């Protein structure tokens, strides 16, 4: 996975630990 | 998928986590 | 699909997420 | 389909999403 | 401005970003 | 600004970061 | 700033750290 | 695993010892 | 600063120690 | 195990003697 | 300073003793 | 066992004679 | 100074006797 | 056994004659 | 000075008689 | 047995004649 | 001076008669 | 001077008659 996608995924996954899979 | 489409998709998908698949 | 058509389709589809298929 | 016809069709179809097939 | 006019204007303006004011 | 207009503006502005003000 | 706007801004700003203000 | 990913993982795992797997 | 923002800031700042202010 | 990882592990393990495995 | 922040700071400061202020 | 590890182990073991294995 | 901080400081200071203030 | 270890052991053993094996 | 600190200090000072103030 | 060990043993044994084997 | 400290001091001083003040 | 100290002093002084004040 390209770097910008890896980094976007990291923050989206982090937010999901708080708000859920949705 | 071309870059602009990937990026538009990311934001549309992010909005769907809040508002649903609709 | 040509670019202008892709872009028009994107916005029409986005509006449909709010207002329906109609 | 020629470009002007494609473009006229797009707007007529858009109006039909609001007012119907008529 | 009424909604259908706003929406027609949006697409005409979008097309002008590609083809010019003409 | 109404929500659909805000959202259309966001994507048009995003595209302009790649293609210019035009 | 509303939450969805804050979150969209975060990702757009993150992308700008890689690709510039544009 | 690349270094930045190892380091991000360490802090995310540390936070999970306090807040859970979520 | 709200918790999710504090946590996003921490990781963005950590990445900047490696890649710069950009 | 690389030195920085050994050292991080030592402090995390020390904290666990007080706060548990969690 | 809250506990999780104190603990994150400790490890970031420890890493800086090896890699610098950056 | 390397010297710094031997020395850290000595103090951790000494503390355990007072506070337990934990 | 709280006990866990005193104990972390002791080991960090001990390591500095070998590796320097850094 | 190396000299520093012999000497540390002597004092730890001496303390145990007063405080126990623990 | 509390007992555990007195005892840690004794061994650290003993080691310094061999290895220096450092 | 080396001389310093012989001498330490003598005094520890002498103390045990007063305080016991412990 | 407390008894354990007196006794530790005696042995450390005895060792210094052989190895110096250091 | 307490008895155990008197007795330790006697033997240390006796040894000094052979090995010096050191
Ligand atoms: Cl991730
Ligand atoms: Cl996506
Ligand atoms: Cl689309
Ligand atoms: Cl059409
Ligand atoms: Cl417009
Ligand atoms: Cl915008
Ligand atoms: Cl931001
Ligand atoms: Cl980890
Ligand atoms: Cl931060
Ligand atoms: Cl460890
Ligand atoms: Cl710190
Ligand atoms: Cl040990
Ligand atoms: Cl210390
Ligand atoms: Cl011993
Ligand atoms: Cl001391
Ligand atoms: Cl003996
Ligand atoms: Cl003495
Ligand atoms: Cl005497
Ligand atoms: Na992750
Ligand atoms: Na995921
Ligand atoms: Na996505
Ligand atoms: Na999707
Ligand atoms: Na779409
Ligand atoms: Na569609
Ligand atoms: Na159409
Ligand atoms: Na049609
Ligand atoms: Na517009
Ligand atoms: Na216009
Ligand atoms: Na924007
Ligand atoms: Na704009
Ligand atoms: Na930001
Ligand atoms: Na910005
Ligand atoms: Na870890
Ligand atoms: Na994990
Ligand atoms: Na930080
Ligand atoms: Na910052
Ligand atoms: Na350990
Ligand atoms: Na462990
Ligand atoms: Na610190
Ligand atoms: Na610092
Ligand atoms: Na030991
Ligand atoms: Na042990
Ligand atoms: Na210390
Ligand atoms: Na210090
Ligand atoms: Na002994
Ligand atoms: Na022993
Ligand atoms: Na001492
Ligand atoms: Na000292
Ligand atoms: Na004897
Ligand atoms: Na004996
Ligand atoms: Na003495
Ligand atoms: Na002395
Ligand atoms: Na005498
Ligand atoms: Na004397």
| Residue B22 · residue F7 · CB < 8 Å | no
**I12 to chain G: which residues are within 8 Å by CB?**
14
CB contact under 8 A, F18 and B8: no
Q: Report which of P5, R21, F14, O1 is spatially closest to residue G8, judged by C-alpha positions.
A: F14
| Residue N8 · residue L10 · CB < 8 Å | yes
Other beta carbons within 10 Å of M22? 11
Nearest chain B residue to F19 by CA distance is B4
User: CA M13, M15, M16, M22 torsion: positive or negative?
Assistant: negative
> Which secondary-structure segment (H or E) carries A7?
helix A3-19
O8–chain L nearest CA distance, Å: 7
End-to-end Cα, chain D, rounded Å: 23
- Measured in Å, residue E12 CA sits from the centre of ligand 4 at 14
**L8 to chain J: which residues are within 8 Å by CB?**
10
CA angle R9, R15, R21 (to 5 degrees): 85
Other beta carbons within 10 Å of C10? 18
Burial of C8 (0-12, 13-18, 19+ CB in 10 A): buried
- Cα–Cα distance, N19 to N3 (Å, whole number): 24
> Which secondary-structure segment (H or E) carries I15?
helix I3-19
- Cα–Cα distance, O10 to Q4 (Å, whole number): 12
Instruction: Please report which ligand is nearest the Cα atom of E1.
Output: 5
K19–chain M nearest CA distance, Å: 9
- Cα–Cα distance, L12 to L6 (Å, whole number): 10
Resolution (A): 1.4
Q: Cα separations (Å) of M3 from C4, M6, M8?
A: 66, 5, 9
| Chain M contacts to L (CB-CB under 8 A) | 7, 10-11, 14-15, 18
Q: Which chains touch Q (3 or more CB pairs under 8 A)?
A: N, O, P, R
Q: Which two tokens stand for residue G14?
A: 């993150």
M17–chain O nearest CA distance, Å: 5
| Residue G2 · residue G10 · CB < 8 Å | no
- Identify how the structure was determined: X-ray
Q: Report which of K14, O9, M17 is spatially closest to residue L3, judged by C-alpha positions.
A: M17
- Cα–Cα distance, C17 to F8 (Å, whole number): 13
- Cα–Cα distance, Q2 to G4 (Å, whole number): 67
């Amino acid at each position: 996975m390209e770097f910008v996608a890896k980094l976007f995924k990291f923050f989206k996954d982090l937010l999901a630990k708080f708000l859920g899979n949705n």
